[PDB]
Amino acid sequence: RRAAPLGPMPNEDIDVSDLERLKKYRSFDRYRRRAEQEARKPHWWRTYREHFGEESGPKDRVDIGLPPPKVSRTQQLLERKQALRELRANVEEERAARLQTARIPLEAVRAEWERTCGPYHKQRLAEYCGLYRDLFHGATFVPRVPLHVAYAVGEDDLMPVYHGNEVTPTEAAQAPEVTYEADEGSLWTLLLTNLDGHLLEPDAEYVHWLVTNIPGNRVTEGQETCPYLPPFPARGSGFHRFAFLLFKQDKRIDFSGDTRPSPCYQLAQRTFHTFDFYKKHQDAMTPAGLAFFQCRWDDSVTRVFHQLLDMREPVFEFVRPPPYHPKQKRFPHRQPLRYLDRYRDSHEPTYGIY
Amino acid sequence: SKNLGGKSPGKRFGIKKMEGHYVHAGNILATQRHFRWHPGAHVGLGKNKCLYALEEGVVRYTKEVYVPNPSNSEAVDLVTRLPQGAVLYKTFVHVVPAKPEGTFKLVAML
């Protein structure tokens, strides 16, 4: 009893008649490539991808962005062609190539990267870390404006926050230096959120530091809604993720609703939904920049809970499920003696009536 | 007589768990004389070529592309002689893992 294939069978295309006149890949590598391209297509039979969670598979993206920078294709192309002609022209360069001695000025590449395709890379790192999944729930924005955040570890020491990086809570005890490039007709809103580590509410987060009505690049000049509160993960749980969001706003927005007390050391008072907060001001605010970091419990955090929050300090474990044992049988057959220990309650003799 | 000793019992080579079943880590999913089913995700291969589950979960069978290990002469030769569009496919067994890896509990509040 045969069934009929649904759509195309994979190799049904090439001709079996006259195999000698067909070109082969005599390379293992070419094969590997062709195979990895075949492994990425949407087949009609049960596949690995299907069961193993491509994570929603195809998804139409609601995009709350800043509009992509408009640049002329042909002009750019010509300019790059010329630059590469120039660079290929020199004999010095070629000498540097053959003799295996050359270096790339990494600072300038980091510059060009930040200027060009950086936003997209930062984006997919954010998607990777599920920033968009816990913040806007469906929504992807491209970080058009680069956001430079740093902490002062000392007089000469500066600890940068790139997307995804690890930082110690000791470093983050103070509010960070924030830099980005805008002229001023501008108004911005900066936000620091702890995406997880809320104690009561799985779906909610903590606002650490919230600033508003920010003229230009001027950081301190904005009226602070929520005063800086240093990172406080809990001892057991590993690696909370903190997010710096940057919103370009048009009209000056005032919120007495979102304004918090000046000391504000209460946790119920900082409880936050980035989604909701954005829904409110959605018309004026468009999210522009993003930078975020990974952070795990360290010594200094102990001081927080006791000294600031007036709390005991919660500590967690990592608890694995108890191992699976089959129903115990009256006559375990052909089973090792140690069998009787798997169903043992606790190791201690118990003399019942004795 | 001329013919002798054809007599041996079956080996019960077969497929023990089937698509959609639940499994516990260490269950034998199949046992085979030659490779018929290849081990996929979370499925260990034994030295007798039998497939067993490395994780608690649900069994799934799947067709997938076959890219042999370059240390294997035979397979790389078979792959190397194919017409330029063709791709070897094979049948795999996976276990889609069920329980979460672990949980975080509150030990003590200091």
């Binding site: 045969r2 069934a3 294939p5 069978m9 994979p10 190799n11 195999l19 039979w45 | 067709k63 496919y89």
Partner: peptide, 19 residues
């Protein structure tokens, strides 16, 4: 499996002639 639509997906030997 003979009953299924996906039968003979792994079928190769007709592509390479070694005899």
């Amino acid at each position: 499996y003979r009953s299924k639509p996906t039968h003979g997906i792994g079928r190769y030997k007709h592509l390479v002639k070694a005899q």
